[PDB]
């Protein structure tokens, strides 16, 4: 497998880039959900 030396590093790099892209996308989605959200401290979901 070392005679194909670049191969497993390339696959690992591509998968790592894909997974980091998924993580960045999840962070962006969470930021969009939480963007500009202001809630009161008095807010109690068990009663309201």
């Amino acid at each position: 497998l070392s005679e194909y030396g670049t191969f497993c590093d390339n696959i690992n790099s591509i998968l790592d880039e894909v997974n980091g892209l998924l993580d960045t996308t999840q962070l962006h989605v969470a930021d969009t959900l939480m963007q500009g959200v202001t809630l009161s401290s008095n807010l109690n979901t068990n009663l309201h």
Binding site: E3, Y4, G5, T6, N10
Partner: protein, 49 residues
């Protein structure tokens, strides 16, 4: 300062440079052959192998 926009631009450039370096490095892989150099193949062996 280490801001995200310049990081993104340099990431574009560095990703391109890494992809080209990786493609160039594929010329020095052997893929199971006795050598990665076609000169070595054509000098060390007669045509059938």
């Amino acid at each position: 300062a280490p801001n995200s926009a310049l990081a993104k631009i340099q990431s574009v450039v560095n990703s391109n440079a890494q992809a080209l370096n990786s493609l160039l490095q594929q010329l020095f892989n052997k893929f199971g052959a006795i050598s990665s150099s076609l000169q070595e193949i054509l000098s060390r062996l007669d045509p059938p192998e």
